[model samples]
Target chain A: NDCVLDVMHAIYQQNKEHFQDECTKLLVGNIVITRYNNRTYRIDDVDWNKTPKDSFTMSDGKEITFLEYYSKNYGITVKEEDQPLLIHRPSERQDNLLKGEILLLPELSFMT
Target chain B: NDCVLDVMHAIYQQNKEHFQDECTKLLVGNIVITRYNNRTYRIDDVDWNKTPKDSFTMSDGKEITFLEYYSKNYGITVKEEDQPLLIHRPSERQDNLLKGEILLLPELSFMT
Candidate 1:
């Protein structure tokens, strides 16, 4: 991830205008992918151009800058162009859940 | 920090109702602290009973759970009862932004 992030970072820095457009492009693709797959993957978790924003978190109790985390875990192995979309595949449904609308909401009540 | 969080967690767990109230208590105190110090510290950053939440980011680029990060940095050193408020202290004002409302706005324009 770090390897890919580094290359992507340089690519983005060198072409900021294109980078902004790419974010849009990736997002469009992400939305389409979600509709086709019927699931959502929080991309902020893997967005390389990230930092100490609320989007990223790890298994352990430590926090890190996105760049630092990516660089350490995935630096210089693959170019962003070569990378496949990290779409979160959905779990195999029990067929029943799919036959009915998924609750899509957590149980809650207003407590005021 | 972790030490304080763990203790706070234990305390909160042992007293859930108090914990909810404590969150409110801490927040109310935080507002008072903010008014006195005139700065806002994103407490979510240092809050301990956490993990994989948006609040914790590490310097090394690895996102950690607040618990993991705090535990590693500040664990079991002190109990919550003995601790002082972690209110964010503001930098001394140069005595000019006061004449104006701290500009509380970022520079931007409507693009669309």
Candidate 2:
């Protein structure tokens, strides 16, 4: 029965914020792989301050943000505008996660 | 339904010997991790000439075959006396699959 499960979930929800911090701490140091390139990445930190809606200028001075670059490249639309970006080590010379240019949407990544 | 499944299984079982060769060819180059030390090994070859019941002498002049060594150390009994042993590369100085001493039991191995 879901009786014990429901009570456990209820207790967990009451302490959800605490559990969230614990979960983040445990997960942040692990490795993950992006579905796009199939390359491995290490979680450096999570940029809760930045969201998918944020935009930055590329080297070409074009304003193609995560919102467009993801969909254009992989055809995967970013629906969660308020979700935090994950800071993973670069599979490239973009140091500390592609010079911080390769911040990933959580949905397209799989934990390795 | 069970109809198609049973028919397919029948065909597969009839050609099981041929499929065995094909499967070995595909699997020979892959990597696997042993449950004992949690170290990885590469599938080097299959020594059909060897079996789990085969015996080899240790440097101390004591004979501890795979049959005894596995169960003595890990408590995993080997029941198949005629089964072919899989040769995997070394996780140790024992090169070429522990100097050909690390032939594995299929039951205790997992394909990675």
Candidate 3:
């Protein structure tokens, strides 16, 4: 379904005034959000830099790989090249994210 | 003079049979080498990922930025763009180098 794609496009469109051309390229996908630590994380490529040994503890104290996290939580299976970017933040405050920020966003595939 | 260039060319030439085409690109410049901890570090660009606060302690218990280390020990200064690649190991051991490995190399600018 295009429901996810539509939401991302809408968000981009609404904020188009601020983001200008940079926001234009984001209309081809969807959105998801999750929270960790004290910060909000906008999930992009879900598997960027991931390795088999990768694991994270959820709020419930359960440890799981990112692939498991998405499949069990979001009901979606992400591919390798379609991996999310995991943008540290959605805005211009480009700092390295601290551990356990909430993450959710459209695991988008931009149109060619 | 071209002493640095000559040594790098020699090393690359001597190892040419091993490195083949990969070693061919190293003949344009100078060489510098230093040791840290236990490993021999073939110093390339002095300021590859340097920040203003970058500093390291020498074998003598003296601490300094990478730039200072080069100048006081090697009698040469390094620039920004000519930054060297600190190959973790000269061989196929693609592991992240442990702390305090010696570094040196031809901070060569390939002839464009």
Candidate 4:
């Protein structure tokens, strides 16, 4: 059962251009719906060349993988290493000392 | 890979009220996204009171089950039979003689 999402994740990683034709591709200005939370978010940025596997965070000088972050917080596992991630920033985060933005995966995301 | 989605479909069929709190429940006036087409639609009605398996149609005299309708048209197999089906009316279809609407399963619909 769990492995199904892993296959779906990998399936999405290999197909980007095809999905783009249908307009499901995440862009800088489109609004997207998250599957886990059903929250709407305005996409501010999209990195087509980089994937979650290539992104990381450093806390207490300790590196934490984005894969772990999603799995722990959202109960989502990132199985494909080639898929891109989207970014969102709330209105109040502009003055924050640290960047208060969220990284989203497209597999669990839908176009609005 | 195919069986994975079937399992996922069954998993979603057993849960409804639990997902409503997250605001993912398909309701009237809510814009929704479809998995097959990636098209956005404003949901006009939600038959939360009825399950898809119980909602069927008789064509000229033939019985049309949603289970068969979705499987044949959308490639969506309805396993649980107790999940709800949503209705959508496109702007251009309101005045047509026959109801120019669509029946969508909640399993494939996303909140916007």
Candidate 5:
């Protein structure tokens, strides 16, 4: 769902007129709100170097990046490629996950 | 550099034929040995469901998948796509890695 209230608040606070073209994109696209970390970015406002990094609704509300969006949320390690990560599966898979591959997602916990 | 001693040990332990073609790949191509875990695998001898997985230098010694090869080594996360993984680069990349994204590769550790 669109964070209509937050958008309205931002528009009110910024004193900017809202356009439907932009607002519609925001409303239609998938939306997720996360705490912003400024220190994670360099001085140029570029997030290229950011990791497990994030993006807000972008006003356009487009899914910012596929990897960060999924990996961060799922607690899977993000990499530049689809590398094989040997995870320790206590459930259906435990016979072949590489040694020490299973790791706890950043904010998610797992049971032993 | 090739681990001549380790290669010799495997050959001696396995007591297999020492072919020039295979030996050349082992010497020329990059080779890395890791402690494999049987628990990570499901049942098909497949590594698809694994993470941070490792592969030993096969007698053929081909560099394995791109992701596991790099992530498990550089302390980066292994993901399916070129997703940006946050890393805690104390020397060159801090002030950039994401909070949760900057997770240390499962086996790799960081200073700060």
Candidate 6:
């Protein structure tokens, strides 16, 4: 797993814009792929990005921030900015995020 | 952490009822101590003990069995009978269980 994570990390660093653009497309309809209990779920047609809020409210009205959500529901953390890239396939992360979003950390990419 | 899990295992094996009895006391007011995302929470005044069904419905109406609940909410498993004992402090597990509950595993004690 570490080997794959390491290689994937390199790929992400080398193609930062590619990944960022991918995340931006996901915001079109609030589609998201969330990790819970160490498993990933592609929740479709969800309104998870309507605002600048730090958390999400599930269909069941359960409100949770990305940090507590991962910990309480996925046995992981968002402490490391690279975590999303490690855990999420590039397309999945991109599907749920918008441009300029920083719920996770990574240096901004320049088109240069 | 493994040492603690192992030692707690031994203590539970030596006194099955002692621990089972502990879990039973917890059902009185539907009080529960649930492990989620590798953390523990003391959910008080719950109604988790009202039926013989295999799953529980949370306040938000998300239904889950002890098995899925632990996995999805706590990053743990219920495959082992004694997992409850290892994950929960004796008093906490005991406080939320019923005498005949098998949500966890242990052999019957005759007190012989």
**lDDT: the better of candidates 2 and 5:** 2
Model 5, residue A109: C-alpha shift (Å): 48
Please provide, for model 3 over A8-71, each residue's C-alpha lDDT reduced to its tens digit, 9 standing for 90 to 100. 2344344333332223234223333332222323333233344423577767888987667667
Global Cα lDDT for candidate 6: 0.34
DockQ of each: 0.01, 0.01, 0.01, 0.02, 0.01, 0.01
Interface RMSD, all models, one decimal each? 20.4, 23.0, 28.2, 19.1, 27.6, 23.8
Give the per-residue lDDT of model 5 (tens digit) for A1-112: 2221232234333322222122223222221122232111111111112333433343466655535655665555544332111123233444634222222111221111
> B102, model 1: CA deviation in Å?
25
lDDT of 2 by residue, A1-112 (tens): 1221233234435444443354467557766666667786676766657877888788798887788888887888876667667776554654323354457666666665
User: What TM-score does candidate 2 reach?
Assistant: 0.37
In candidate 4, stretches whose alpha carbon ends up further than 4 angstroms from where it belongs are A1-26, A92-98, B1-112
Poorest stretch of ten by lDDT in candidate 1 chain B: B103-112
CA lDDT, candidate 5, residue A100: 21
A87: Cα error in model 1, Å? 7.4
Off by over 4 Å in 1: A1-27, A30-55, A76-112, B1-112
At residue B6, give the lDDT of candidate 4.
30
- Which parts of model 6 are misplaced by more than 4 Å? A1-53, A81-112, B1-112
lDDT tens per residue, model 6, B17-65: 4433444453222322222322222322212233222565676888776
Q: Assess each prediction's global lDDT (C-alpha) against the native.
A: 0.29, 0.61, 0.38, 0.59, 0.29, 0.34
Q: Report the candidate with higher lDDT, 1 versus 4.
A: 4
- Interface residue Cα RMSD of candidate 5 after superposition: 27.6
**Distance from true location, Cα of A86 in model 4, Å:** 0.9
Q: Candidate 5, residue B71: CA error in Å?
A: 8.0
> On a 0 to 1 DockQ scale, where is model 5?
0.01
Per-prediction CA RMSD (Å): 21.9, 22.9, 20.2, 18.0, 28.1, 22.0
Candidate 3: where is the Cα deviation over 4 Å?
A: A1-24, A27-112, B1-53, B81-85, B90-99, B104-112
Query: lDDT score, residue B33, model 2?
Result: 61
